[PDB]
Amino acid sequence: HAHAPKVIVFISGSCLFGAISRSLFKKLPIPYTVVLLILGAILGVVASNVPLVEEHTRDVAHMDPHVLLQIFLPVLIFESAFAMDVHTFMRSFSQVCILALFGLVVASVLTAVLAMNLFNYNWNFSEAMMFGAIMSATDPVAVVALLKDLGASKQLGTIIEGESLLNDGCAIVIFNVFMKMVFFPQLTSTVGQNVLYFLQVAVAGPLWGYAVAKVTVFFLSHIFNDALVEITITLAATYLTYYIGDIWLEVSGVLAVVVLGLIVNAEKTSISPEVEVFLHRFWEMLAYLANTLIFMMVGVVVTQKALVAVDKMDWFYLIILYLAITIIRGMVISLFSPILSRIGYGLTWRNAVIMTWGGLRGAVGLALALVVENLAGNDVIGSKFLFHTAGIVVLTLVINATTIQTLLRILGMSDISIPKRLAMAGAVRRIHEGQNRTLNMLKSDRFLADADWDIATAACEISDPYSPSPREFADMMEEARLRMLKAEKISYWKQFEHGMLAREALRLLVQHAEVAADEKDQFILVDDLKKSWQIKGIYPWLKRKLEDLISEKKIAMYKICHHMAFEVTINIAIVLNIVPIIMEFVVQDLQKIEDALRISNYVFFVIYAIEAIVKILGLGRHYIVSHWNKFDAFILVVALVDIIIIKVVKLFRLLRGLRMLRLTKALIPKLILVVNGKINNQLSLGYDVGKGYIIGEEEVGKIIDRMVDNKKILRELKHISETGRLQVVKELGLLQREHPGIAVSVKTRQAIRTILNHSRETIHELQGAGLLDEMEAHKLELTVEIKMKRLMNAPSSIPPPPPENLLKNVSWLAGDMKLIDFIKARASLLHFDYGEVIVREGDESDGLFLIVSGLVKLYGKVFEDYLTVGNVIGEMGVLTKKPRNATVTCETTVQVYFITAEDMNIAIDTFTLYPSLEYRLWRVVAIRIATPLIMEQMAFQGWTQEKVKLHLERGYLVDLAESHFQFNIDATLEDVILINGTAYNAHTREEIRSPCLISRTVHKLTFQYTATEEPRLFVVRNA
Amino acid sequence: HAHAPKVIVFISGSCLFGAISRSLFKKLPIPYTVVLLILGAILGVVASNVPLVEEHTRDVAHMDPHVLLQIFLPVLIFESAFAMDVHTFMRSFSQVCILALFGLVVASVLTAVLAMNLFNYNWNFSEAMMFGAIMSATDPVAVVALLKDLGASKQLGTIIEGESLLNDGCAIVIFNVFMKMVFFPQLTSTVGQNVLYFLQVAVAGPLWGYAVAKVTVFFLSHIFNDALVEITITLAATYLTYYIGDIWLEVSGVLAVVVLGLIVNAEKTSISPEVEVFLHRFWEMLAYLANTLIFMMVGVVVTQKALVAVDKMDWFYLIILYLAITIIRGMVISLFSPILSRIGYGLTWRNAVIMTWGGLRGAVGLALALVVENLAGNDVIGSKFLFHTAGIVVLTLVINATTIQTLLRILGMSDISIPKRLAMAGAVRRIHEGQNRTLNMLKSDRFLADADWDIATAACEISDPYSPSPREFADMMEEARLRMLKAEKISYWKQFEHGMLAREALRLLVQHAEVAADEKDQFILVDDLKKSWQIKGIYPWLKRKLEDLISEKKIAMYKICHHMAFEVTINIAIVLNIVPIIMEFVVQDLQKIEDALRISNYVFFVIYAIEAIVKILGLGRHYIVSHWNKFDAFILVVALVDIIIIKVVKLFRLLRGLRMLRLTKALIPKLILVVNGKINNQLSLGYDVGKGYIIGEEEVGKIIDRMVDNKKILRELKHISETGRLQVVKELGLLQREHPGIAVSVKTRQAIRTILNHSRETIHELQGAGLLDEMEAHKLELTVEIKMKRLMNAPSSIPPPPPENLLKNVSWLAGDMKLIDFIKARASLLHFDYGEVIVREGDESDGLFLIVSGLVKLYGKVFEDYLTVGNVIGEMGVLTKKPRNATVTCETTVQVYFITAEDMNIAIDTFTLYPSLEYRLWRVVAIRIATPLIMEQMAFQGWTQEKVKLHLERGYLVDLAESHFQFNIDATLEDVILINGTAYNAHTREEIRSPCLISRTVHKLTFQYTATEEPRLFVVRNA
């Protein structure tokens, strides 16, 4: 049949040709795109003779320009943006913006001048600027792929990629401008019109993209368990944004799509992870299809109607143009180098050379050249444009793309560093050992004894891809420093893999560690981490001001005046009435429409009059005290004036202003929520990085004790770590005090994340045991994922709980309502000011302190520490009745719940059960004492501190009421720690001190009925 | 600009409307498709008045029929096929084929008769058959989703889905036929032409799809580390198959796409797993887009130009038609029920009612109705077709789709079974316990003490979604039987999750277990498992015959006559020459072409003459003995006759036949490989299921010893398990003997799979420790995945290794070339026939037997067992010098390497090192003895037998040369087992027997220097 969609044949053929090209030239240096161009040229030449191939090709090869752009360019641009590492892009944004915007301007201008002066085509400035804009387009994929693969200068890869993104967007903008100037020349517009056009293309585009992106992520964050909807929304958002911006609004669509991609890639937390991984490959595949189609269309067109108008001088011009554009890009990079060196990551001459050589052209330039070809028609301009663009693309893909690897080798950037080589060698050796063990296991299997082991061993073998004095003191200290940095990086990776750290915090910590590792005796100084948790003053200032604006404490039928429905109704009334207020006056700027709209205006005036009467008769004389109500009264005044009544054009403005401005009262709270959200993001990263650093320091300080030899260097390293940890904890406490609600929200979020992660772990564990079918386990996992996604929509400003809630949430006051009542009755609330001492070292343990507000410093004896809300001081005091262990000083205004030692003795005596109160207290103290010991003995193994704390949580405290000697049964036992008192090994009668871990070899423990030091011992069990 | 692609707006709008519909009506019973139809109707009515909306809609709403089909129908059909559970579909294929093909025929015929007689439209039979074909289309999604969710009658879900797939395909075929009969009426064709047309649509379609699918999977199985290529190949294959089949070949494209989807979904092992999971969602999303677009187009068209021609009687006809089609489907199901009950899964009346009520119509029927609308144009036929189709779709989506849940409730199918409720309750309780533990852990954290715990606890809470006598003896035996079945299912799931079982074997075992669990005292009888490993005689017969054909033992310049290049060259010559032999004669059926082709024919005759002279002068008088060479000589005879010369038309056939038939010699070996592949698949499933059953029986036989009480029922269960295991092992050994090479290939494949799985596990383990960066670990994982995918392309017929290789691959002869030489010198090869006894019980241990071929039965004293190739007999004999433990009887012709006890004593004495030969022997024996003990004590925990064997592999044998008493240090120790001799606990002097596991409580062991029973003890260590 004649009306078959022949485009399908061409599309699928391009797919298969791309498959063949990639498969065959996977290992060769020449990229597959050149093969696609050659195949397209062959296809075009054969079509020129065979009419059937012409029938199958014409539909796509001679496609309309607008179709080409509005289908392919959004795909290419959004795939480029959605592939970005947005965070390093933003941290190098100024550098990339300079290098991209100003670099494109200069390069395109110089290329246009070259085209006008060198070429004999006698082009005008508009056509030459079009040419330069096309030539300035860039394609980083083949170079950034290598830079990401080699791992050298990870910053350079993203600088190149983002520069390509931005220069491609701006090049498309410039191309559209000059294309409209040359092929659709309108009348010479006024300078004001040109300024408006500039604002419309350069400013309105990003704002349109930003609005669409924020709306898109808003909806995405409220879709649960519907992947198809999320993917469909993303796709439709991209295409609809481009179409609406470029056509309806005449706004720059490419920039809008760039902003949309960046914003969604940043807010990517709003997207379910599985559809995120789906979307990455989906957009990669769409971009691949677009690239293949564009290259094959270029081949067809260039062989059909471009080379026919090519002369000998054109080749010389092509060579000169290639050299010229290379030199121009190099000159631009070197010229801005003085500026870029002082901004962001800076530039080395090696990085600059890679940037200069790696500037490949690609699909964007070819698409624009095809547009020029279609628009020019019979004119030679299109032929020359397509010829030169394709020639330079071919040259870059043949010379630059193939020689970039050799250049990276020559400049010394491709060298794998020694640490990576050592890590790979160790991993390969461990893999070989595991494979040998598995082979030995299999050879013993009766059902596999006859298997050909030579073939198996050959098949499963994995190979290494990379295959007392000052000098001595300096060597030893460098060794210790590098080893500590490696241990810290390992700790951060372990923290992340178990879900305790977000990716951003891990990346910050790791990159800081690496930077410190290549700068003399530079450890990870806290000052660099400081910038993570430093809140810019703009957000706190805005919060303070805006919250002042909505402070109704001057004010706080009457029942309705303070009921929600009233405000909701009037808000809806204003928002609805705004639509007529726009439509009517724009229509005036048909009488049966105006009169009806003015009747509706009477109706809305009646609604406002009813509302004003409501407020007056409810709030009495207090109504007009509020400035908001003053504005409302002025609204009613204007309404009376203009309903009783230059008057017309006066009314058209007054009834717009007085009515549109009334919704700012409802707007401001949402703006406060936005400010809270940004502060929450910054504070969340601050907490993540600070806590990660503290935990890593704690783990490494006990790792190094067994892996660094000299005592003095060990002490120096410990001192450095302790100083950093103390500073970090103090800063985090002060931040908590500055913004209570945000800190509470962050901590609740972290708690929920941890609980849900461990719940998913339990689900997986009991699925592996086969106790749940895959489908039911999947259902439970779906519930977990839905809860986790709803977590992202937390209020972000949870009000701080009152002291009573903190008292009733203490670990050893969980449940047990009667004990909570007793303690709340006995407790007293004490307030202290800055610099005061709550309690001193050596004092008698007169009671507990539960910090309900503030921050305290704990000095002792080198024992400096900081405590904040929730922490309770003096448990050891009341339990063992020994003197105070530390001096408590307030670093800020502090409020503490004080419970006397006598009230604690009374509570302990009065409350007794299997979950004994004293049992709970000693359990908490014993876990806190035990965790450091278990890490000190076993931090060299893969256990994190979280694993140790959960391991102890599974344990129990030995009673010694049913016995007076403890047997290491090793069934229902995994490890033992002593806390209080002294014990003796039954057989050898060796002595164990109070805080000592029980050695593995020890068999049985003997105790004494010494009430003064009634021994307490902790045990953990396997099953 | 005017030439903007307005289709983009409509597509993206349909996307957003679908998103809104799904989001809003997620919980309501009404499906979102009805909402989409209503929205499309609103859009059409508003378009009829607003011309701009008409401009934006016309491009899609009034789309060409061919575009509609060739874009959407392939997507819908391939998504339906690629979503299939192909294996249960194939195991119910006959039932589905009856119910679908004959059911569609009857239903469509009856619907057409109803249309002709009831409706006043005065339709002819062609139009009525079109109507019936449209009405017969089905959409199971909303019902199969529930059946898969509830888990009741999993077979019913796939029966419905496959019936829908096949009936939709056949309905499209019938619609195409009658559409061509009515709207493109050609001249009345002859009956032979009709038969050819039937073969072309019904037969050639499936074959075209099969060929394309096999080629596609062939290419997919040779693409490594390129996801984009795989996805692009799949997409292009689907569309190109449909286009080529329907247009170029005029072959049924829908059936071709159905076969393509099924074959790819079956050969899905050829696809990289990540792109498999990508592709499932990709095709689901494409189908979703197609559905949304079709529904919105229906709304627009029906509101614009269909309802305008609707009358009151049409609604009555619609109601009558709905009732009629429902009754017809029910009648068809009940009428075929006698046949379907005796085929496959059968049918209950409840399942039949669900099938009758769940037959929803959908996108396919609407698309065909739109085709009829576009083709009919101004005729009322299109209006009536679209009206009735849309009305019935709406009615089914409103009545059937909403009431199917209530019907499943009424029929008692929605009830969750008690075991699932218990499993869910236990999982929820464990999750609550884990969350409470995590909460206790967090509350102790100093940095989270101030978090609002009420909010967290409320957020993280997961809730249960489902919220001595004959009578007593029968209850107890049922309890034990059900408990054993549950344990077996758990064992199968554990085996699968650790990668020891393929999914198919697990599903077979689990479904067999469930079937046995609901049928009186029916355990898992081996007879059901037998059909898994039973090879159909067709493949062995074909292998034997074809391998006989290529037996060149009559035959096996001369150097070239037996060199590969010769045969390769002549094969290429024939395949190349066939192309001219086709082109020239078809062109005859321009003279400058024929003469050149005949010169080329002379050239190829010269090549054949050179080849024949080659064979003659090389092979001498032996040349003509081979029948293949007789045919070759006859080829040369015909070539001479027709080159020297009715003659023309004689030549046109003779030079085709004699030349095309010569390539069968090269074809046959590949066909033998195909036969080997199918036998390999069947044998691989047989081994998987048999070994899984054996392992599950071994684990459950030791689980039950601690969880079933009465001794007699325990003995009965043990006897049943032992009988099943013995039969399974015997059958597997016999299968191995029948097909040696295939068994060797399967076992090598399993070994490589296990090794690579454990290597990936090690990579993940050391990544979690942070010892490798994510990128390098990803590189190693990529290498592992590439090796695993290449594993799928194994030869499948690895030749059996010779006895020397088996001797040099024994576990304790690994490496150590000198010992291998000694043993190969000392060893002797003995041959035994059926029924002979190699050695008897109580005999003196005179030497080892290594089975190099055959199968042996080991009787002893109730000790019946079977051993096969690779297994070695008599190790205990030579080590402990005790009498023979069992009687060895040959169940088939057996060959054994015999090494005398004296040679073993000499080898032991002569060879001594840290990896001592006696140490190796005792290590093997100790592991074999120890594994049962560790399972017997700890099979109740989550450990599988593989975990136990690896756990022992990490261990070592205690020397007792540096000491005579063993200390349970519990560091560098995890468990202890005794093997030989007797030991005593140092403190209590309690006695430990030779095979006993050392108790956890025991402290230290004391031994004796009794050489007669020199004690051997095994130890495993943690770190």
Numbering used by the authors:
A (entry chain B), B (entry chain A): 71 to 537, 570 to 658, 671 to 703, 725 to 780, 796 to 1011, 1031 to 1192
What's in the article?
One example is the sperm-specific SLC9C1 that belongs to the SLC9 superfamily of cation/proton antiporters, known as Na+/H+ exchangers (NHEs), which are essential for the regulation of intracellular pH, sodium homeostasis and cell volume. The transport domain (TD) is accompanied by a voltage-sensing domain (VSD) and a cyclic-nucleotide binding domain (CNBD), which are regulatory units usually found in voltage-gated cyclic-nucleotide-modulated ion channels, also referred to as CNBD ion channels. In a recent patch-clamp fluorimetry study, the functional integrity of the domains was confirmed for SLC9C1 from the sea urchin Strongylocentrotus purpuratus, termed SpSLC9C1, identifying it as a Na+/H+ exchanger that is activated strictly by hyperpolarization and modulated by cyclic nucleotides (cNMPs).
SpSLC9C1 adopts an inward-facing conformation, similar to the majority of eukaryotic NHE structures, with the residues of the binding site accessible from the cytoplasm forming a negatively charged cavity. The voltage-sensing helix S4 is in the inactive upward position, as no activating hyperpolarizing conditions can be established in detergent or nanodiscs. All positively charged residues reside within the membrane and R1 (R803), which is homologous to R368 in Shaker Kv and is supposed to cross the entire membrane electric field upon activation, is still high above the gating charge transfer centre (GCTC). Prominent examples are the clear densities corresponding to two lipids embedded in the cavity found at the extracellular half of the dimer interface of the TD. Further, they form a cytoplasmic dimer interface and interprotomer interactions, with helices CH1 and CH2 of one protomer wedged between the helix pair CH8’–CH9’ and the CNBD of the adjacent protomer. Further, we could identify a network of salt bridges between CH4 and the core domain of the TD (E606–H157, R609–D155, K224–E616), which might contribute to locking the transporter in the inward conformation. Another interesting position is K939 on CH9, which is coordinated by E300, and backbone carbonyl groups located in the dimer domain.
